[PDB]
Design a protein around this nucleic acid. Structure first.
Lengths: 234, 124, 190
RNA sequence: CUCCUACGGGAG
RNA sequence: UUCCGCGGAG
RNA sequence: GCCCGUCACGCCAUGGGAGCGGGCUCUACCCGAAGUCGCCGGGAGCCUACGGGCAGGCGCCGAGGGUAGGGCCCGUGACUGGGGCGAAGUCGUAAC
RNA sequence: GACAUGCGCAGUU
RNA sequence: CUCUUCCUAGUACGAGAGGACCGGAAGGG
RNA sequence: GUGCCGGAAGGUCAAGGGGAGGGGUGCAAGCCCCGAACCGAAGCCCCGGUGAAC
RNA sequence: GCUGAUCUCCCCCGAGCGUCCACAGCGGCGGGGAGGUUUGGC
RNA sequence: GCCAGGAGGUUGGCUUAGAAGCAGCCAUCCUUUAAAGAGUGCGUAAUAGCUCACUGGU
RNA sequence: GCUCUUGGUCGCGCCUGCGUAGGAUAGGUGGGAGCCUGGCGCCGGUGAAAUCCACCCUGGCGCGGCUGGGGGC
RNA sequence: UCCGUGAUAACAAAGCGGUUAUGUACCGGAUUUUUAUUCCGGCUAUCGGGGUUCAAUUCCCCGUCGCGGAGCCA
């Protein structure tokens, strides 16, 4: 079941703008692009989910992140469809690293989320009615998936690491298991559980991210059908 | 420097100069006060430090400082040079051992007296 | 020709525009010129000269019947003084400074005829006949003359404007004749 | 170099 | 220290 | 704001300098003690046990001394050259 | 550097 | 022609501190 | 300042050119005389360079 | 050579200095001479 | 020549440390009585003796 | 001999003249009341007035007299 | 002596008949930290007389002085 899926259209990515480190994960250079070795991919997928599973069954929260458009939306899905926090917008700086302080805003969210429905709305000038309402639009615009648990993650899953290496860094300074789906345009080393494979074609992203959440749930009870993947998927 | 070079050239030992030529590495040197003027402080000070030139035993003649308040050295006073630069007066590189030879100790000093050769007074 | 050819002046109107334009000579040493006041002249010209008499308020009966058209007194001294258009010409003889209403608002005015008896008389000759024409800086000369009514009579220019040769030092030769006007002008030995 | 002398020589 | 008889003393 | 160099004044060391003083050494030749050694010991002396020894004579070496001409270092020198340092003197403004 | 006296020691300058 | 040194005497005089008259020798230039 | 060199302008300048005008004579024509303007070189004045020119 | 101002010399007077004391030794201001070595005059 | 008293208040002021003629600068009086000595004079520490400026006999 | 080119002179021939008021690039004093065949002319002011005729000062131009210089053939 | 030629204010230097050029040095006053500069303004004139002209530094005459040239008396 695995192979075929991938072999389908979810491997081989960035070309001639690679990283030599990632030379251990790559089969060849066809007509230009680097054809990643799936054979090995699989092996890594294993150890990765092993970890995920050996964690999804011990009451541990994971934080997913994907700030790239050719992978935003989906990440928004797979997260809510698992209760696992996540980041789809601008991954603020010092989140994990300055959690206590970033949290401060999360609190400010509900601070308004509550003043939203109230009789205090009868008063208050249009100046603030617009200020706050707006101050919330954005407020709510960035933390939609960064609230849930008021405690750091036990790990973090990600699409293109190098794209969000900054998060990664934060993670690493705070000692936090790093797992992610990286292609040839990234350096393994600073990645703990490496999912080698295309990071732009939503095709591969969906898949590798999909079977991930399921696996997160297989260890919770409630195996069902996939999530809304197609809507304009090519 | 490579070893081979070291073998050839080799390191050179420093050898330093006497911050004070009081002759035959001598604790002190005697001599006559050729003159006794009164120069002026350096860079940021102002005052009338008392200095005196001295014809040393060794046919030498140099400026020596004089400690404490007041004194009594004249154009022909025999004296003992101690050797202590006075960092604040260019040249002065020796102090005059108070209370020795023609040098009179300090009158009424009660504190540090070992320096300034003042005799231990009685309290009665 | 020979002397003059007065008749040679043979178009226009009454040709009274005759003159004496013979050249001259600058002033030798310390000198100048000056035409003899009312240069006699063997003619009368038949002119009703408007001779002005610097009289007063007493001489207003004869000053007019002596050869003058009209005559004013002292009620015009500083009366015709309030206009640059309100003001012949005589002058109060003696040392009297007639140069009070005559020293300001430039024309022609100097010596005149004397007679502390009356401005008019039967002996009121020479005061409507001839006049003057002195130095012109560039070259004076330029005199007057009768009109196209006389043969050798018009030959007054001679012993008159020509005999004017009376005032002059010495540093050249007063000559270079030429007579006539308002038409053209010929010239002959003086 | 210093000394002694009986100033003739000697001494350390 | 012009010490007592190297050994002692000053 | 900072900052340059001349100039003036004071103190110190220091280069050049007609030169003047002393120390060390090298070369050469002249005199040359004591003494060792080498000749001789003749037409002179002393001793003998006749071989010989001493005295004395001559020579080489020779401390030093003299004269001469070099080399190396130190001191000092009219004046002269710059250099160092010294709370508030002069002239201008080179540099940031 | 120079040495009184007694026998290098001690002592003098 | 003149000098020096020596004996009278380092005695007359003399706080002195040096030093003679008179008289007699012997060398010099 | 002097010398020398350079300056087809000016200033001054001798003969000579020029003749306004005047004089001596004769009866006269004439013969003779002085003579202003103005035109007139080199030189000098004037303008400028010049010191291994004074 | 004459002359002798200049000059060299000495002299009269004597202030005043010398513990006292015109003069042991000095001599003010001033005066008189001598000599012919200086410088000069004729 | 010689005898002699070689009178007393005089030993007065500056300087005195000594003018008290006999250091020098100022006085120059009186006097009892043989007169007189404003005692010119050798000195010395000023004083302390002689000398005539005073006269009997011979 | 022949050209080219410039001066100085007397002629003569036409121009030449831009103070401030002001019909505007008024030269000077004179004649002057009309000549051109359409401006008068005072104007009102200006030190001084315009049409036209003159003789003339300043400077220039153009043919002629008489004298002069420099270039070529 | 004779011919010509220059001339102004403390000094320097102008205006080929139409009413106080101008510069310096000097005295102010503005601006520049000071000074120099710069600016603004003020200066005991037309070498002295006398002429011509409506009008003059300008043209005429006489004098003084400087300039330059020719003769003077012998």
């Amino acid at each position: 079941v695995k192979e075929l899926l991938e072999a389908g259209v979810h491997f081989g990515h960035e070309r001639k703008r690679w990283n030599p480190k990632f030379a251990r994960y790559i089969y060849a250079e066809r007509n230009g692009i680097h054809i990643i070795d799936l054979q090995k991919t699989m092996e890594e997928l294993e150890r990765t989910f092993r970890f995920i599973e050996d964690l999804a069954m011990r009451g541990g929260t994971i934080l997913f992140v994907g700030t790239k458009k050719q992978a935003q939306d989906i990440v928004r899905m797979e997260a809510e469809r698992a209760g696992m926090p996540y980041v789809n917008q601008r991954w603020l700086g010092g989140m994990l690293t300055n959690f206590k302080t970033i949290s401060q805003r999360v609190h400010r969210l509900e601070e308004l989320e509550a003043l939203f429905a109230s009789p205090e709305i009868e008063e208050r000038p249009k100046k603030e009615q617009v200020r706050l309402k707006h101050e919330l639009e954005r407020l709510q615009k960035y933390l939609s998936g960064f609230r849930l648990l008021k405690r750091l993650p036990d790990a973090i899953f990600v699409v293109d690491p190098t794209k969000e290496a900054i998060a990664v860094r934060e993670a690493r300074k705070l000692f936090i298991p790093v797992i992610a789906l990286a292609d040839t345009d990234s350096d393994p080393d600073l990645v703990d559980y490496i999912i080698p494979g295309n990071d732009d074609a939503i095709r591969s992203i969906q898949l590798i991210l999909s079977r991930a959440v399921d696996l997160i749930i297989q260890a919770r009870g409630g195996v069902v059908e996939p999530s809304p993947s197609y809507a304009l998927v090519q | 420097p490579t070893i081979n070079q070291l073998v050839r050239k080799g390191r050179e030992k420093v050898r330093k100069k006497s911050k004070v030529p009081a002759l035959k590495g001598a604790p002190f040197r005697r001599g006559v006060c050729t003159v006794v003027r009164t120069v002026t402080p350096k860079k940021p000070n102002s005052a009338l430090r008392k200095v005196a030139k001295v014809r040393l035993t060794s046919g030498y003649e140099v400026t020596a400082y004089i400690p404490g308040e007041g004194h009594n050295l004249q154009e022909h006073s025999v004296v003992l040079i101690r050797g202590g630069r006075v960092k604040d007066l260019p040249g002065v590189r020796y102090h005059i051992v108070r209370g020795v030879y023609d040098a009179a100790g300090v009158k009424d000093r009660k504190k540090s007296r070992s320096k300034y050769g003042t005799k231990k007074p009685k309290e009665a | 020709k020979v002397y003059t050819i007065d008749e040679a002046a043979r178009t226009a109107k009454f040709d009274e525009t005759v003159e004496v334009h013979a050249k001259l000579g600058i002033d030798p040493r310390r000198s100048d010129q000056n035409v003899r006041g009312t240069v006699s002249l063997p003619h009368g010209l038949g002119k009703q000269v408007r001779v002005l008499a610097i009289a007063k308020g007493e001489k207003i009966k004869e000053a007019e019947e002596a050869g003058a058209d009209y005559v004013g007194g002292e009620e015009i001294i500083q009366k015709i003084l309030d206009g640059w258009m309100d003001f012949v010409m005589g002058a109060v003889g003696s040392k009297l400074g007639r140069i009070l209403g005559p020293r300001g608002l430039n024309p022609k005015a100097g010596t005149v005829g004397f007679n502390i008896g009356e401005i008019i008389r039967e002996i009121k000759a020479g005061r409507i006949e001839f006049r003057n024409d002195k130095t012109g800086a560039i070259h004076a000369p330029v005199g007057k003359a009768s009109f196209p009514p006389e043969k050798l009579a018009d030959n007054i220019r001679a012993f008159i404007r020509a005999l004017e040769a009376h005032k002059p030092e010495g540093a050249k030769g007063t000559f270079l004749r030429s007579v006539y006007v308002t038409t053209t002008m010929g010239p002959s030995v003086r």
